[PDB]
Amino acid sequence: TSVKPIFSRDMNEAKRRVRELYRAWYREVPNTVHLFQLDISVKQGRDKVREMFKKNAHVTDPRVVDLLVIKGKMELEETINVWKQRTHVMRFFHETEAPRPKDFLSKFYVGHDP
Amino acid sequence: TQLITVDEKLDITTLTGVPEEHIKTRKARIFVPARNNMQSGVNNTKKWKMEFDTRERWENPLMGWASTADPLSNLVLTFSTKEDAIAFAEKNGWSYDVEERKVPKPKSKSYGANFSWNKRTRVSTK
Amino acid sequence: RYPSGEERCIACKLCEAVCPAQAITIEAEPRADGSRRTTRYDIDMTKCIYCGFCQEACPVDAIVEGPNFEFSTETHEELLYNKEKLLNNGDKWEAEIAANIQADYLYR
Amino acid sequence: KVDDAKVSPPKRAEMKTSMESLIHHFKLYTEGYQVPPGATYTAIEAPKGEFGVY
Amino acid sequence: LGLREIRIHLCQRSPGSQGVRDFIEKRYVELKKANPDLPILIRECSDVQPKLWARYAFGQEKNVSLNNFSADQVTRALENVLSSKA
Amino acid sequence: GVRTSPTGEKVTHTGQVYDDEDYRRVRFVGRQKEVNENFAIDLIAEQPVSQVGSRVISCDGGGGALGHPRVYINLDKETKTGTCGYCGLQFRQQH
Amino acid sequence: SNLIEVFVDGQSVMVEPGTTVLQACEKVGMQIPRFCYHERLSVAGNCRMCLVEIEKAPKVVAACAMPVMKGWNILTNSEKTKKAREGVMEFLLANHPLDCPICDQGGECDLQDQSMMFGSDRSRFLEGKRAVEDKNIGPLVKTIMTRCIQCTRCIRFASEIAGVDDLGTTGRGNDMQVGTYIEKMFMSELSGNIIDICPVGALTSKPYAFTARPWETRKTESIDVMDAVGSNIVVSTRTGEVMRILPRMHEDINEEWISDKTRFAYDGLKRQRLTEPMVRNEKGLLTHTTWEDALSRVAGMLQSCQGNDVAAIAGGLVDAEALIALKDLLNRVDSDTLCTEEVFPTAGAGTDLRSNYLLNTTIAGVEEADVVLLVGTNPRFEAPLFNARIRKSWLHNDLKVALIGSPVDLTYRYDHLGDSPKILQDIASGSHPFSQVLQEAKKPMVVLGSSALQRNDGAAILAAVSNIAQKIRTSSGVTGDWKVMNILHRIASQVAALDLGYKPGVEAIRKNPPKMLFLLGADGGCVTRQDLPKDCFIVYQGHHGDVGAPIADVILPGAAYTEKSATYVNTEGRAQQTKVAVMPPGLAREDWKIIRALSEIAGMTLPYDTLDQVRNRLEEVSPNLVRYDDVEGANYFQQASELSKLVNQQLLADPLVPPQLTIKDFYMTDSISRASQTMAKCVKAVTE
Amino acid sequence: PTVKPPTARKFIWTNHKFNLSGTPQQYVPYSTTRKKIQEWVPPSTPYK
Amino acid sequence: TRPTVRPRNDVAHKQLSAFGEYVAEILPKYVQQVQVSCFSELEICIHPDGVIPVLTFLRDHSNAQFKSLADLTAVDIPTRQNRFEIVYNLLSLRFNSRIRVKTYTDELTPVESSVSVYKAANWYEREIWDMFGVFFANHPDLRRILTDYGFEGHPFRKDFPLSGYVELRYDDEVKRVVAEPVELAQEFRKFDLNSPWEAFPAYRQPPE
Ligand code: SF4
Ligand code: SF4
Ligand code: SF4
Ligand code: SF4
Ligand code: FES
Ligand SMILES: [K+]
Ligand SMILES: [Zn+2]
């Protein structure tokens, strides 16, 4: 069961890295709002950041969360410089996809999918 | 020692990039594929396969082609043993159904049985 | 077509099995006189790469790649040829396709 | 072409006459030949340099 | 309101259902002679735990565990089910 | 031999024709439906049956290498004519 | 141990005495090519492809027939073995026609595959080929005898499995033709399976002809629902359209065979379908409407009913999920009047114990029996593969078969005891010699057909057969692990309905007529509107409109067995699950989804949302409905036979006759087959 | 073609047509297959 | 076997076997398997922990001098517990030869980057991070190199489907290129082309 760690020896260093990444993203959001000329508020971007951080909140593996931190740092580097376009940044906000049916009755009405 | 102790189960569900709709609603099937009865070869029934359930395929309004919206429609995975397939299944968080391998029962062939003296296995003709 | 009016294809599906871009769609059923003939033969010209695998995998010289190249359209769906368009193209360019095949059939 | 008809397709005149030629033409233009298992790396001198296929 | 059907799930090999099986071999037929209109479905399974299901009116299903229960215990449980009707 | 549907649409040799209530006929209004007026069944029905004096016959479709693969047709039955699988030409023993 | 040592390519292996070279090479792992050999047919050895070389011996031996001895080394990859294979296949392909592009076997042809594998690369034949005159053997099997290679699997299948003895070889030399010598139709239960075991394209499937190609068809492993045998099948589809149905190899049920109805009911499965929900208008005609409107009308009718005012009749092709969903929905309004079209006698032990309505031994148990007594059944048309297993045991294990009922043709010679049911009373008393025959039998077997329980005295017949079985089992030399009492079912949705606590028979509905009725594809016509009261809200849920749909107020389109993942229990209690091959057409949905949505609309929401939760509910009702491909034993025969003696039902004097006597009545049974054109063509062929 | 004319056939067009794209005589794609599933038409008589 | 069968080179086979024994006996700590193919190619399957001490040896030893890195590759085989197979191809200009070094890793365990050995790998293994997810520890700049900027998932993994989970189209309401779930107008028709008969008896695996 002995494996090779990536960055964190246990959960504490990994969640510290998560905390630092969240601080960096929260500092970075107003700059990406200003430079990309987005039509959204800063609070909307920060709550989207919080939603994306809480999406992966069930991970209890140091290597998986280390890889998640690495990918988050990569995305932060890609959005500090303007390598993402307005489309790439705005793709986190699904503005063109209609909300799918949620309950059983509407899903029964609209198709065969479970 | 440069090694750590990890006791939790494997979970690569958050790293593969698959949306959750194609994770919590899919039902994989792990099975040895059935031999084609029109042929006689048995080389296609050697390796275990992982397949997914069939979703909706409809007809195109213009040309009548088979339009689909299922990204995993043509995903067949090959595994040497059942345990490797089941480990790949639970690694990615897919609910699975496992079918046992159906090895054919050996017979007792006899060419002399076609020419018996007091039995019913006499061939009518040849 | 054969030199009696009968179309050459007998729906063997070699061309759609050898087409690398999957541009050929074939659906067949037995017709009135019990002959193995196609019912749907669709070639997507926007999928086709124009490499001549279908014209060289055809056992009865049915599908051919004619010499015409001035057929650009103004609409996307006009480049989605069904069986009727291909048969009309064959009847339009048979007088050239037969001569080209007679010229080049000894190299195959 | 190579004279191995299980790799290269036969001549079109032989395909319409012989039986084994037609069978090999069918199985080559539907399924394709079977390559023995293994891995290789073949490199040539393309005009841009070493062009390799693994 | 009252009883509608009884379901007994048991096992054929494991000893945990053994006394339950004792019931089916000793105190069933006369029990079936006392309730001619009560469907008592007996289901055997290869590796199931002993179980007793009671269905009342309007789909009220109640569950009773019968693991390592002797003939007297499962008999008393069945009398409680029959005489409860709740 | 192309028949005309009651809506005015033409019917292909396959038999495909859009229904009266089918909306997809909006693709044909202001334009034309491309059909071929040379039906293969009617043209192959005009070919005469060839009388030959052999029990079996060999057919290649004509032209040699420009035709279909060569096949052998048995003509033992006298009630019906043996037909080529590819070309559709029919032969008959004259006896 | 009598295992002896042999060598395959220098590798040592153990074999039993009497083992062929082919089986030993298969045990090592080498598949010797073969054309005429079959593991389920007699050894013929008339193709010479399997010629393998034994070392230190100046001759090649036929591996499909040569019995091995000790010390043999088998060279499966030497030079002269390959030379023999190449010469034999050059001879085989010398006279073969150039029909590959116009052949349905192309892409799945054994001759093409081993020509690529073991054959040569060119043809030295510079002569003229032969041309065989074609034959007609029916509208199912298309015959082109120019492509036949004279492998004689036709003759062995029709002589040892189908038992027809109508196929043979006429001629001598290169002009020998495999046929029937006269205009005779090869009509049988298993007449399609020759298409499975023809290595060339000589025998093809006429409905499937010129439609698809084997390399572009997706194969989905599913379960047949056409009868109660529960045949494992493979549905080959192509872009959302079902093309063909092939057998699956299951050694316990349908080894590699299927009946003709299973193979050829798909074209009727895609005809006369229900696509949208219809409701009655102000003129009493069915007009199309939305799902919400029809479900709201049905829920509004259901809300006003309570107690005995709502009932249900189950069809013959219903899964356990839909059955348990309808049972829960009707239990929410306190209605236990759930019925099935087929009748099973409930007087006595009833459907409480699982011993008295199951084929308790196995399908394969006929391989262990020595005396089999068939009472009031025609197993050739009701369970064709069970009859095939009986014939296999009769031919190989020298089984003794006796029949009570009409003297029908079962393709083997049995002992007809007469059609009088009172003859059964003679076995339970001992005045008949067959009582002594059963007493001296070590592993006896008594099979009672489900069609004999449809009569008025089904309880009396069941009591008599149970008395016979208990007299035999407790007085003869039976071990105690053996199961004698067996019942052969004919409805796929029968055992699963009985395990869920349904009431078999519609006499409970006739006793107290309901105000609204539920039909789960019950097309038998057992209940009509004349028996029902004046204003009956009949709701039909199914896929084909045959009998119950013209009399229905609301039609709810359901899904077929190829369009949903569904649980079916065969006649021996073995649960199996089908898979989704295609999707239901139009607005048709899954049946349990319809019932659960109806409960959701009505304010009586059921506690399951996905298929797995419904399966957990199924396991709650009965566990053996979720253990797939696992036969569960059913004990306590003594208690059922003791309870059966209380009700002294009296046998009628009428003789026992089945509903199917000839080949005409087999093809059109239920709504799937009655809406088929191939079955109609088969009926038209056998009538003339 | 004045000295080497092509072989004449019955099906070859006698009137050549140029590129018809953008004209009312342009090609329009459509499916060339019949309907697969045949629906169940309800009876036109009430159950009364 | 003269005009059709490819000629066999035995001197190169013997030399490569001798050099494989040489490499295996020089480095017994990291070298696990050494094999020579039938067309005279040498494969050295090694431990991942010896990615660096092996390669520099082949870069710096006087008898190897494999100064060129031709190709760096990764192979995804899902049937193993270590599904990723990283393969280095080395070219020696001095001795005019080619060698192949293979190693294994799974999704989570990182492997040491060889940017201190060959700098071309500075891009090459970065490409692997874009398409297989194998994280290369101690890299100067590791990011995506071929896929889209907002792309999620590694496309060259075998469990990743052919078509992606998203597609791009222009929307005039938001005046932007938007990503939507994929809906193919015609499905990619999967063909079953495997022959059911055994082809090569020399590669016949023994049964279980
Ligand atoms: S020429 Fe076009 S249609 Fe023909 S095989 Fe090539 S890509 Fe396909
Ligand atoms: S066009 Fe030629 S290759 Fe294609 S299906 Fe027709 S006969 Fe076969
Ligand atoms: S049976 Fe096989 S070899 Fe013969 S024509 Fe058909 S595909 Fe070709
Ligand atoms: S028709 Fe087919 S199965 Fe019958 S003898 Fe000929 S090759 Fe064998
Ligand atoms: S398989 Fe043995 S001779 Fe045919
Ligand atoms: K066949
Ligand atoms: Zn011809």
From its phi and psi, is residue I96 left (phi > 0), alpha (psi between -120 and 50) or beta?
left
Residue I159 near residue B77, CB atoms below 8 Å: yes
Q: How far apart are CA I85 and CA G462, in angstroms?
A: 67
**Is the separation of the CB atoms in F75 and F55 below 8 Å?**
yes
Query: From CA G597, how far away is CA A91, in angstroms rounded?
Result: 35
- Taking the Cβ of residue I110 and every Cβ of chain A, the question of whether any pair is shorter than 8 Å is answered with yes
- C36 touching G, CB under 8 A? yes
Interface test with H, best of F16, F17, F66 (most H CBs within 10 A): F16
Tokens of residue G415, six digits = 């002992």
CA dist., res. A88 & res. C83, Å (int): 43
d(CA A22, CA A16): 10
Say whether B112 sits in a helix, a strand or coil.
helix
- Which chains border F (3 or more CB–CB pairs < 8 Å)? C, D, G, H
Amino acid at position G313, single letter? I
- Any idea what DSSP says for residue F60? -
C-beta of residue G463 within 8 angstroms of C-beta of residue G470: no
Phi and psi angles of residue G592, each rounded to the nearest 5 degrees, phi first: -65, -30
DSSP 8-class letter at G54: E
- Nearest-CA neighbor of G502 among G311, G299, G226, G298? G311
Distance in angstroms (rounded) separating the CA atoms of residues I76 and C75: 42
* Residue whose C-alpha is closest to residue C27's, from C19, C16, C35, C18: C16
d(CA B30, CA B50): 5
Helix runs in G333-443, H state only: 379-382, 384-396, 422-429, 433-440
Q: Is CATH 3.30.160.190 correct for B20-114?
A: yes
| Of C25, C48, C64, C81, best ligand 1 pocket probe by most atoms within 8 Å of the beta carbon | C48
Structure tokens at G350: 């009833």
Half-sphere exposure of residue G204: CA atoms within 13 angstroms, side-chain side: 24
Q: What DSSP element (H or E) covers G617? A: helix G611-621
Q: What is the DSSP letter of B97?
A: E
Q: How far apart are CA F72 and CA F57, in angstroms?
A: 6
Number of C-alpha atoms within 13 angstroms, CB side, residue G145?
19
Cα separations (Å) of A86 from A81, G342, I153? 13, 67, 21
User: How many Å lie between the centroid of ligand 1 and the Cα of residue I182?
Assistant: 25
**Which helix H or strand E contains G179, and what residues bound it?**
strand G177-179
Show Cβ contacts of residue G65 under 8 Å, excluding neighbours closer than 6 positions: B111, G20, G43, G45
Closest CA to I46 of I66, I26, I60: I26
**Do G127 and G83 contact (CB within 8 A), yes or no?**
no
Q: Which residues contact I45 (CB under 8 A, 6 or more apart)?
A: I31, I32, I33, I34, I35, I102, I103
What is the CB-side half-sphere exposure of residue B28 using CA atoms within 13 A?
28
φ, ψ (nearest 5 deg) of residue D49 = 135, -150
The residue type of C92 is: K
In which element (H, E) is residue G196 found? helix G193-196
Domain that holds residue A83: 1-114
The residue among E73, E17, E25 whose CA lies nearest residue E49 is: E17
Closest ligand 1 atom to the C-alpha of C21?
A: 7
For residues B30 and H47, what is the distance between their CA atoms, to the nearest angstrom?
50
Q: Does ligand 3 lie within 6 Å of residue G204's CB atom? A: no
With the most atoms of ligand 4 within 8 angstroms of its CB, the residue from G114, G180, G200 to mutate is G200
What is the resolution of the experimental data for this entry, in Å?
3.5
Furthest C-alpha separation in chain I: 70
How far apart, in whole angstroms, are the C-alpha atoms of residue I45 and residue I37? 13
> How far out from the chain centre does Cα G642 lie?
34
**Are G596 and G617 contacting, i.e. CB atoms less than 8 angstroms apart?**
no
Of G187, I62, F40, whose CA–CA distance to C39 is shortest? F40
Interhelix angle G110-117/D19-30, rounded to 10 degrees, is 90
Between the CA of C12 and the centroid of ligand 2 the distance, in Å, is: 5
Ranges of H-type helices in G397-518:
422-429, 433-440, 458-473, 495-499, 507-511
- What Cα–Cα distance (Å) separates residue G24 from each residue in B104, F36, G29, G41, G55? 15, 61, 8, 18, 16
Please state the separation of Cα I147 from the chain's center in Å.
Answer: 19
Name the β-bridge partners of G554: G279, G539
Contact of H13 with H6, CB cutoff 8 Å: no
Q: What is residue I46's three-state secondary structure?
A: strand
Q: Which residues contact G371 (CB under 8 A, 6 or more apart)?
A: G399, G400, G402, G437, G438, G441, G443, G444, G445
Give backbone dihedrals phi and psi of G225, rounded to 5 degrees, phi first.
-120, 10
**Pair G559, G589: CB distance under 8 Å:** yes
Find the domain containing E27 and state its range: 1-86
CB–CB contact F87 C4 (8 Å): yes
Nearest to I120 by CA among I68, I74, I84: I68
DSSP string, C19-86: -TT--EEEEEEE-TTS-EEEEEEEEETTT-----HHHHH-TTS-S---S------SSSGGGEE-HHHH
Q: What 8-state DSSP symbol labels residue B119? A: S
| Strand ordering across the sheet containing C80-81 | C24-30, C36-44, C80-81
3 state SS of I73: strand
User: Do G258 and G193 form a contact (C-beta atoms < 8 A)?
Assistant: yes
CA–CA distance, G291 with A105 (Å, rounded to integer):
10
Task: Say how many CB pairs under 8 Å bridge F and G.
Answer: 28
What 3-state DSSP class applies to G356?
Answer: helix
Cα-Cα end-to-end distance for chain G: 59
Q: Which two tokens stand for residue G196?
A: 């499975």
The answer to whether D12 contacts chain G (CB < 8 Å) is: no
CB proximity H34 to B under 8 Å: no
Beta-carbon contacts of residue D21 (< 8 Å; ≥ 6 apart): D5, D10, D11, D14, D15, G122, G123
Give yes or no for a contact between G517 and G311, defined as CB atoms under 8 angstroms apart: yes
Per CB-CB distance under 8 Å, the chain I contacts of D33 are: none
Q: How far apart are CA G468 and CA G421, in angstroms?
A: 13
Q: Decide whether any atom of ligand 2 lies within 6 Å of the C79 Cβ.
A: no
CA distance G217 to G238: 5
The response to whether residue G105 sits with its C-beta less than 6 Å from ligand 3 reads yes
Residue type, I113: S
Q: Which domain holds residue F77?
A: 41-93
**Alpha helices for chain I (secondary structure H):** 11-26, 51-60, 121-131
Q: At F52, which CATH number?
A: 2.60.260.40
Contact check, Cβ <8 Å, A108/G584: no
Q: Is the CB of residue G109 below 6 angstroms from any atom belonging to ligand 3?
A: yes
Token couple for G110: 């054994």
Cβ of G142 closer than 6 Å to ligand 4, yes or no, is no
Which residue, among A91, A77, A82, A84, has the nearest Cα to A21 in the 3D structure? A77
Alpha-carbon Rg of chain C, whole angstroms? 14
Q: Which residue is listed with tokens 């599908």?
A: C63
State how far the Cα of G106 lies from the Cα of B61, in Å rounded to an integer. Answer: 32
Question: DSSP letter string over G201-248?
Answer: SSEEETTTTTT--GGG-EEEEEE--SSSS--EEEEEESSSSEEEEEE-
* Rounded distance between C-alpha atoms, residue G378 and residue G657, angstroms: 9
CB pairs under 8 A between A and I: 48
C-beta of residue G80 within 8 angstroms of C-beta of residue G60 = yes
Q: What Å distances lie between residue I120 and D45, D48, G186, CA to CA?
A: 19, 17, 73
Q: What is the 3-state secondary structure (H, E, C) of B42-66?
A: CHHHCCEEEECCCCCEEECCCCCCE
Residue G372 near residue G399 (C-beta atoms within 8 A): yes
Which residues fall within 8 angstroms of residue G358, CB to CB, at 6 or more apart? G486, G487, G495, G571, G572, G573, G634
Contact residues for G59 (Cβ-Cβ < 8 A; gap 6+):
none
What is the C-alpha separation between G553 and G287, in angstroms, rounded?
10
Q: Tell me the two tokens of residue G203.
A: 């025998």
DSSP G305-322: --SSSEEEEE-SS--HHH
Instruction: Name the residue with tokens 């066999």.
Output: I8
> Comparing C-alpha atoms, which of G425, G324, G480 is closest to residue G649?
G425
Say whether residue D4 is in contact with chain G using an 8 A CB cutoff. Answer: yes
Pairing mode of beta strands G537-542, G516-520 = parallel
Per-residue burial over I136-153, b if 16 or more Cβ lie within 10 Å, else e, is beebeebbbeeeeebbbb
G358 DSSP 8-state letter = S
Report the alpha-carbon distance of residue G408 to residue G398 in Å, rounded: 21
**Ligand 5 binding pocket, CB closer than 6 Å:** G 34-37, 45, 47-50, 62, 64
How far apart CA G340 and CA G312 sit, in angstroms, is 8
- Report yes or no: G532 and G510 within 8 Å, Cβ to Cβ: no
**How many structural domains are present in chain E?**
1
